[PDB]
């Protein structure tokens, strides 16, 4: 056991990544196992250094948004903790693999740039894939829980779940495939 690390509870070493394009850009196994999603981490000092950042910490940073959350990070860690604890119930599966699935199945593998409304189609770099997937599924949650009785942990959990199996009931998937159809038309 002491050679191996957990977010208190969840194991990393049983994870798998099936998109060989994203194996360089999602950090979860091995030297990227940390006990908490909270490190000082001067990541945003050089260009690609953001790729080394453990994926759960990236999921936390992208969550404290819209003004009256800027900076409040300990709330974000206590949100993520609860979200995973709910996910393990709603499935009975490992929470980290579900997160890795919901990131892989949300990166739009083609987008349309603007040239002149005249657009053109282009393919997205493997880093932008994950950078967009994170944004999308954290906006889905923040949006689903703005005036409902549900709690942000509940909505983030069911968002990760409904996305890890592309279901058209999740904001992320809808927006991704809708961003791809617009590219498909003006190919």
């Amino acid at each position: 056991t002491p050679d191996i690390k957990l977010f208190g509870k969840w194991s990393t070493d049983d994870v798998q990544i099936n998109d060989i394009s994203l194996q360089d850009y999602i950090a979860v196994k091995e030297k990227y196992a940390k006990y908490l999603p909270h490190s000082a981490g001067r990541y945003a000092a050089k260009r690609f250094r953001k790729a080394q950042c453990p994926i759960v910490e990236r999921l936390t940073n992208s969550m404290m948004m819209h003004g009256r959350n800027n900076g409040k990070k300990l709330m974000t860690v206590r949100i993520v903790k609860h979200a995973f604890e709910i996910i393990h119930l709603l499935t009975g599966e490992n929470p980290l693999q579900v997160l890795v699935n919901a990131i892989i199945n949300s990166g739009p593998r083609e987008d349309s740039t603007r040239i002149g409304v005249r657009r053109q189609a282009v393919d997205v770099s493997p880093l932008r894939r994950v950078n967009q997937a994170i944004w999308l599924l954290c906006t889905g949650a923040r949006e689903a829980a703005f005036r409902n009785i549900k709690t942000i942990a509940e909505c983030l959990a069911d968002e990760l779940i409904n996305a890890a199996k592309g279901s058209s009931n999740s904001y992320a998937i809808k927006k991704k495939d809708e961003l791809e159809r617009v590219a498909k038309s003006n190919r």
């Binding site: 349309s112 409304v117 005249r118 657009r119 058209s168 495939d177 809708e178 961003l179 159809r181 617009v182 038309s185 003006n186």
Partner: protein, 90 residues
């Protein structure tokens, strides 16, 4: 309550839609000749020629007849178009 003998409109049909929100790369519009499954019209497909302001063509709450081009009969993606209509169809 359903209007017609098929709940999902077929390709090449002209439909009555009430535009509801002008999107960033289209508009999210209701469906009023079929039940209210959403529709998305691409902004490249309002008119055949250059436009000065979108509010002069479409604005929230205006019944209009548009032609569907493609649809994922499974997932629910109704792709809609307005360049491709004659006023007789209307």
């Amino acid at each position: 309550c359903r209007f017609y003998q098929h709940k999902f409109p077929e390709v090449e049909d002209v439909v009555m839609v009430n535009v509801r929100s002008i999107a960033e790369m289209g508009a999210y519009v209701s469906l009023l000749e079929y039940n209210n499954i959403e529709g998305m019209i691409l902004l490249s497909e309002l008119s055949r020629r250059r436009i000065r302001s979108i509010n002069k063509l479409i604005r929230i709450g205006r019944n209009e007849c548009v032609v569907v081009i493609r649809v994922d009969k499974e997932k629910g993606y109704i792709d809609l178009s307005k360049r491709r209509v004659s006023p007789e169809e209307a």
